[PDB]
Structures are given as C-alpha cells and as structure tokens.
Design a protein around this ligand. Structure first.
Ligand code: CL
Ligand code: CL
Ligand code: CL
Ligand code: CL
Ligand code: CL
Ligand code: CL
Ligand code: NA
Ligand code: NA
Ligand code: NA
Lengths: 46, 46
C-alpha cells in the first residue's frame, strides 16, 4: 500500500551564498520517494 | 562584467510519471550560472 512520507525542508546547505534546501516526498501517483530542491541564501558571502 | 542569462525550462526528463525540468540562470549576487530543477509530470504511467 501507500503511506504518505514527506520530510521538512532542510536548512540551507551553505552558510553563505546560494545553497539548496532539500526534502523528500512520495506525494505522487506512483507513491515513490522523490527529491525536491530549492535555492536558498542565509547571507551573501563577503 | 555580468550579462543576465536565464535559459528556458527544459522538457520533462520522463515521458510519464514524475520527471525533472531544468534551467540555468546567473540571477544571483556572484553572477554565476546555477541550475534550477522542478518536478514535472507529462502524464501518469501505467
Ligand atoms: Cl498515510
Ligand atoms: Cl517544511
Ligand atoms: Cl530553485
Ligand atoms: Cl521558460
Ligand atoms: Cl520541485
Ligand atoms: Cl504516474
Ligand atoms: Na502523513
Ligand atoms: Na511529514
Ligand atoms: Na530543484
């Protein structure tokens, strides 16, 4: 069967500049785990 | 010297189910080309 699984969006992968925030989810018709990523920036690098 | 460049979102990497669509952009403080990715679904699979 299918049991829903979605993680929280991660902290930004980099402490300065552009990094990624990542989660995983099976919220799709095949109920398979996939990754999602979004750009993030905590602060600019000096 | 920075010339803005953002490509078109690509066709979905898979013909059914969850695939990925990608583009590249330098819209960031370093003016560096970075990839962006998004889940896509053309149609459900069998
Ligand atoms: Cl569930
Ligand atoms: Cl979250
Ligand atoms: Cl993004
Ligand atoms: Cl586009
Ligand atoms: Cl996505
Ligand atoms: Cl599907
Ligand atoms: Na749940
Ligand atoms: Na959850
Ligand atoms: Na992404």
């Amino acid at each position: 069967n299918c049991i829903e699984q979605t993680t929280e969006w991660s902290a930004c992968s980099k402490s300065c500049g552009m990094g990624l925030s990542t989660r995983v989810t099976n919220r799709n018709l095949q109920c398979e785990m996939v990754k999602q990523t979004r750009l993030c920036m905590v602060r600019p690098c000096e």
